[model samples]
Target: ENITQWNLQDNGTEGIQRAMFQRGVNRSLHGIWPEKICTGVPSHLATDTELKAIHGMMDASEKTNYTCCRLQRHEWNKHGWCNWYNIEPWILLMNKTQANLTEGQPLRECAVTCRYDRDSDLNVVTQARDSPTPLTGCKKGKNFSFAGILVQGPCNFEIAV
Candidate 1:
């Protein structure tokens, strides 16, 4: 999420040739390390001051929502050259082993997997992957769905609840 600002200046064009200059400006800023932030419990464990500090370090404005990526929908063409369609849907996994918060406890880890869901929250209908074995079987009225996947990192810590 590091922001590298680039400036491109174009000089007057003559025929088909134009003069272009590129300059890069490095600005010190904060950004969440994608790998580390993908984990689910950092937000809950950190103090308010700590959380704010982390947020201040993130490049929030440039964050990408993976669900909206065109690559996520390529699966519709099951046999096309763009075979991303054949790939499993991506899900975040939050294992119980990763829930430990005590000192000396093993560090818990969350990982993203390509999987699918038969059903999920209405808000997340498009967010699931297609799996041969339905990954989610939560009843409609249940408090939690089974489609959760975990990514590591600080932002995920905020979502521990």
Candidate 2:
């Protein structure tokens, strides 16, 4: 069929160009399952530099294998220990249709919370509240911070959807 209609470009390309272009855009824009943009990293296991290395390796592998992946880190706080990895990431994928439909009012609102779990493979967890129902009120355009653990080994991470 004609998948170009779904392409991001207003006037899409055809043949391999269209397919390759769409694939690139999709990889650039959309994240893998367990989809959350990792906001914080673990504090207990390694330093910030170490965490970055870990994430770098994962991103490289994803690119090489053509698989979508998620990377989450953990941090520590004085009160005790907390983890952002356990929480999910939040994303808004709006098309012309969605924007047109919600033109008059606010696009939508959401609140998010994250946690960390050492036992699981991915080692992170997340929860979010979007509009109508409130877990915490909707916070917009601002990045909030959370505490979590710094992953130490490859086994510490998991594939969560």
Candidate 3:
């Protein structure tokens, strides 16, 4: 059928259109977070105004869409409704958390693990570790190629930056 011709026109402006369409589709698909939490409350409880404010805050932090959307989905779904569904406290918590994380640095191979107190409206932070897991393939005294957000180390790291 002519519908199959959709696969056949891989050349000019049609090709560009299809490529753009494919990227858009892939982006949407990738943005979905698999596990849903706090099922009793609607996942999207934040108002448009509040959501926009959160979005802008994350943007100001220079979080990419890939990271931003996933975190937004998590915080909004899991904890947004519990604090009387208010965004102000959440914003304050995020600002403080980020400030603490500033004690850490950016690396292609780092991941952060943080703990917070639930009794304190999730406002009291405990500990944040950058290299909780063993990092492999990083050399002791040479600059090396990198991967994801990582903390390269042997505890007393001697790796050159």
Candidate 4:
């Protein structure tokens, strides 16, 4: 709620906005599990920042620049409305996917799937089949990873594809 306000203001100068931003960022890093996951489809368009945020989180290949963005669009179209197109959970899906990968010892790259725990209060996730699915399309047994040229940035991150 307050996080939405901060986004409206765009300047998180105040303590509460900063605090909310921090909390929002943290919550986004985690996942948001509403008591009952809302299935409302939002009609609003995704902002450029929102799109870039999605892009930045995903590393892509030369051909995947558009391909990756297309997947983002597909996920958003398929599930974005359910969560009101909240960028937090959308990004969290990827975060959860990454976390899911790390959970596999040796960081095994396998087909990973995660979903919101509708019964929980926290944004924590559990593996299961449900709506608003993200990070799909990997085969049952395969090393799944995005192909791209890595470049350095904040947190030593790379923007590829």
Candidate 5:
């Protein structure tokens, strides 16, 4: 993908130098990316207006520690916003969340999974994480490399910028 913009710690390819990501760094990143990519890998950005709509419709109307709209945008572009239903799959939990809010009980986190077909019932399932979403095939992901070795493997870590 964007190896040029890629952030690595033990990367010998980028020249062995210490980068800011050197802390607790040990090994190199995992595989490059997906084997199957979209036909065009469309990367449309989410405008502020679109972000607002998504936030509101997805029950993100509640407060959060992180940026709700920002994450929504990431999920959309990362997973391809080619489908309409995929825009806001978290609505499945909105009613329940609202119920909680109405009952004078707020929430700090919500995590759940959604499943769906992208063809027959396509255009559904948005990114669902840190508070689950409903609909189908709705999953959410953020960018960050893991250093876990299943138990922590042994690897040389060379940081570079």
Candidate 6:
């Protein structure tokens, strides 16, 4: 809602205009779940300052970036209050994939050739993990086709043959 005020004065001026900006891109790390513990979130709980210690560690990530001079404002609103000890449970979901990597050994994706049919639904066929997809064809045409799919970003993950 927009509101305006008028005042009479020797130097009369138009009312001030006020609005807010809200558009940005963000991803997630871990979320807190205090119910997993025994503490209830405080209604008056405040966002942390960078100076605040989380298990003796200062988070370098933007999750705590000083947007409102308060850290984890976005995180705690959902996760509730937490310390490093409690945050790990939510983060561990991503770690299981990391622990299974066999470095010196051939990976499952390596066994999968990168090339997919132009009509196959790539969403089901190709799983782009952190590492690159193993390509089957070495021709320039194949290379360009693969690059095209990748540049489309997450949408290409829905790619089809």
User: For model 2, what is the error of residue 54's alpha carbon versus the real structure, in angstroms, after optimal superposition?
Assistant: 20
- Weakest 10 consecutive residues of candidate 4 by summed lDDT: 2-11
Q: What residue pairs clash in candidate 3, if any at all?
A: 108-148, 109-149, 109-150, 110-149, 110-150, 110-151
Question: What ranges in model 6 sit over 4 Å off?
Answer: 1-71, 80-150, 159-161
What's the best-to-worst order under TM-score?
A: 3, 4, 5, 6, 2, 1
* Cα TM-score per model: 0.15, 0.17, 0.34, 0.31, 0.25, 0.21
Residue 89 error, candidate 1, Å: 34
The segments of candidate 3 whose C-alpha lies over 4 angstroms from its true place after superposition are: 1-37, 52-70, 83-85, 99-161
Best by TM-score: 3
For all candidates in order, the CA lDDT equals 0.20, 0.24, 0.31, 0.31, 0.28, 0.26
Go through the candidates in order and give the C-alpha RMSD of each one to the true structure.
Answer: 22.5, 20.4, 17.6, 17.7, 18.4, 18.8
Ranking by lDDT: 4, 3, 5, 6, 2, 1
Residues 24-79 of candidate 3 have per-residue lDDT tens digits of 31111111112333557563455535544432223212244322444454555664
TM-score of 5: 0.25
Candidate 2 worst ten-residue window by lDDT: 2-11
TM-score of 4: 0.31
Q: What is the lDDT of candidate 5?
A: 0.28
lDDT of 5 at 147: 20
Under the 3 Å rule for N, CA and C atoms, how many clashes does model 1 have?
A: 25
Better of 3 and 4 by TM-score: 3
Clash counts for all predictions: 25, 33, 6, 4, 14, 6
Instruction: Kindly report which residue stretches of model 4 are placed more than 4 angstroms away from their true locations once superposed.
Output: 1-41, 55-68, 99-161
Better of 1 and 2 by TM-score: 2
lDDT of 1 by residue, 85-109 (tens): 1222111111111112111112321
lDDT per residue for candidate 4 within 1-161, as digits (tens), equals: 10110010001233221332333321111122434344445565555456556422231223443223544554455555465456666666654543443332212111123221234211111121122234432233222221111112111122245
Query: By how many angstroms RMSD does model 5 differ from the true structure?
Result: 18.4
Worst 10 residues of 3 by lDDT: 1-10
